[model samples]
Target: LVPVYIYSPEYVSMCDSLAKIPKRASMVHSLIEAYALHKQMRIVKPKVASMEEMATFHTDAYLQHLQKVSQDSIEYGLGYECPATEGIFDYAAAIGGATITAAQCLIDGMCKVAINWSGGWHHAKKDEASGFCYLNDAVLGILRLRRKFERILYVDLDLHHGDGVEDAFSFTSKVMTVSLHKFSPGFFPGTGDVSDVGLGKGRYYSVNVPIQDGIQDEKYYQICESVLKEVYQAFNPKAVVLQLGADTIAGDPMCSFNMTPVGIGKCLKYILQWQLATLILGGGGYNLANTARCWTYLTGVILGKTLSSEIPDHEFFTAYGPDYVLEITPSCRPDRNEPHRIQQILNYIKGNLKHVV
Candidate 1:
């Protein structure tokens, strides 16, 4: 059985700003429903996480403030973009619970892999929110896995840095965090760099591969394969928590990377080949239809099912208009990065790998 998280209709009402997140959630759920119905797969729904469970990675004072505030939760970084709307706390708690449940499934040997598309809000800190993420479910999930696994490897493929998760485990070797993102001074929450490996005892545990705009499939895959292969060899993690943010895809409005869903599938396949207990989570993806497509394709990959590029008729069928196809061609953008530059970054990361092992 594949563990999936589906929130109540009340949870949908809490997503109130910065693009149609509620709409995106609905579209992604619709796609997943269609896939499950077609493939006859069993989906296990998870329960909402309690306050005590959420406090595993969050501060009590912050949680209390979030629960009590009715207006914008500016004190906890939930003001402008991630506003404090009705049912916000409940929404965050439910998503957090879903992620912990997914991790538990792996620990219990109930499933080789589990996914929570509603989870992976990697930007939320222990006491503050950032980048539209009000709660750091990925960190909570990793902590849950620590109950059974000593070493956990976190692979983030978001367009932006996973600062909160990296920071959460900054001084420990228990969780090795690797983030591949487009890093620049202008980028939001700009923290991940090749040099910011780790702190104190956690040195060499954090790996960052900062890429340039318009990174297409070949180069994207090459970087992923090289870094991930070396990471698996060096870390030999007992389990992996992968954040597959679809914003890196070609058509995403918020990001500049030129990747397609095909590249995402290949990345998942590579991770699966490792045969490690894995938990997959979703992160930033603004283009609603494309994000839904990417996750649907990933769901197919996890099920070992080869889906057709032809878009299936569903409730959100109109969204995939005109072409009515799942395959997205790489959109052309200025290639700001050169091959040599990427090789240099890889060489630096490889050099750091020596210190990790």
Candidate 2:
């Protein structure tokens, strides 16, 4: 059995804010605490990512600008994505560091799976920041690992497309990016499309599944099973990185994908069972209640026990704050039943992907 590390740092407060909290940072803490109490996983405290490592994926000019502008923006705020807080840079650096640590740990043979809860800031680009991301941890992590592994497969299951990571490796065959997300005709940062696979030598390196709204657990898993099975056959990656964004769940305030907490957890369980060297990172989940619920299940699965989709315990709910409370209702669970139309769509997508691969 490969050892697993759960990264929770005190410096999370640097990146922790009402805005980020709404994305389920607090819920991650609850899940972290639960794992600690159970002694099912190891906790790894990470050092902050330095400027040199960050520059591997980010532009040095833009990096300088973040430090300069962050000083001014802290009083006010950055754009809506990143609120300029007093220590925004510190928060971004630490989160990035945690991801870097994950990459290093895998190289050192310390663990097969290292989860960096704060590391899925996927929307940040080489020079600009957006979508609640100041630094791009996902991109940096992949870059750090590319030297060791020739073929890298990145699977992003966030509600929004992993715009930055997709963009960074859109033309590289060495790095294959597959994203499943809700698509808008003219959405923010508009990129991922079925035809937007990589170019030339990297042709078909990127796979995009623009899912429709109201996708339940069953339909999501069917498509995922087919797509991932195909992906394994096509790429046969040496290392895999999974971005688990809880925002795809039913009750997120921003986007809508209609996935239940249990449904998302089951998908993650399958990834872990694959037993490939993998790194699981939290991306986006807005509702604190549901976010806590889903991430708790993720921790449970990592610890080798799948929890039921019942209401979370009182201690879990209290982590959010006194006013914050979780619902006692259970969401949808994964069944083998797939609607006919949804299956047809999945088959069509798979057929097209087969042609490309």
Candidate 3:
């Protein structure tokens, strides 16, 4: 049986010590604990990826530079954003290793679905770190599976554009990337314009549906349902990687969307329908309780367990921690009104995609 590997080491440092996202990693750690206890998945410890493995998607020189900087200050170049300390390298390596391990699970067909909730470091580019990411774990995971599959579909559901992943594979038709993110014209890393299709042979391979804010659970599921259908029909890939960041929810501190755990649960339900082998990796969600609850819901879906909106038990809350904050609510309610702006963007892309591809 395929087992989900929990990178416990990834949470060795608490969020309080980190500058911007001290609590983020801790939330993941707490969620892993809750999921393991309440769900039907097996957990295995992960090994750190060596510098050589990381080189698959990063340049040798750049990798060397990061190692040097990590040894000295962990937060050396990130300024006050992503404080770097001595052990950050170990955490980063474990993140890379978890992705590599999960990808192998897909290749081996052990479970058809294996998730490394610690590995959605999508912002790291070929040479540098952007956002809070230090390494492009998704890129490395894909590279590790290059020989097993001819085509791979990457789906990023984060609130921010997946510029790094899109940029990394913009030249290769062997991989297709689809990013659905909050679309503010002048946001940070501001570049997920629908018009920014890839260049050369990779023109239509990269698809972006920049969504507007205030997107709720109903709208989020509808968007996922429609887009996944289209992408699966267009590219019946052998394997797909899903970047499930929970920042789209209502109470998240970083983003302004209105999704609930049910939205993510719905996405997981649809994704399972394809049966095309998936790697479910974690992503951004600052609110500790919401993040934990969302991933917990995802774990339930993956394990075929019933989801309950009943306030999470004490054990669950404690695992997620001191900053946890989410009130009990219903699981699956349909969206109130279809978001026309999102529909327009999706419709426009559906119209122009075939021509461009």
TM-score of each: 0.94, 0.86, 0.87
Candidate ranking (TM-score, best to worst): 1, 3, 2
lDDT, residue 68, candidate 1: 77
Question: In candidate 1, what residue range of length 10 has the lowest lDDT sum?
Answer: 11-20
| Model 2 segments more than 4 A misplaced | 35-38, 72-78, 308-357
Summarize candidate 3's per-residue lDDT along 1-357 as a digit string, tens digits. 544655554333522344555566556555556445423565655667888899888778667767766673332235444555454656677788878888887787766787877668888878777787778889988887776988888998888888888999998788889898877768756998888778888878888988776667776788878877787777678788889888877668764667777787788788887778788888887776777777766777777776544544453466434544433243343333346767787886776555543
Question: What are the clashing pairs of model 3?
Answer: 15-22, 15-23, 74-84, 74-85, 75-84
Clashing pairs in 1: none
Q: Which has the greatest TM-score?
A: 1
Cα lDDT listed for each candidate = 0.83, 0.72, 0.72
Clashes of 2: 5
lDDT of 2 by residue, 1-357 (tens): 454564554645544554557435555665556545336555677778899988898888777767776564443225666765555676688888888888878777788888776668898878778887888889988997886888888989988889789888988888888888877687655777666777776677888877766677767886887788888786788888889888877667764567776677667777777787787788887676667667766777677775643444544555545434332233353332337755665565566557544
What CA RMSD would you report for each candidate?
2.2, 4.1, 3.9
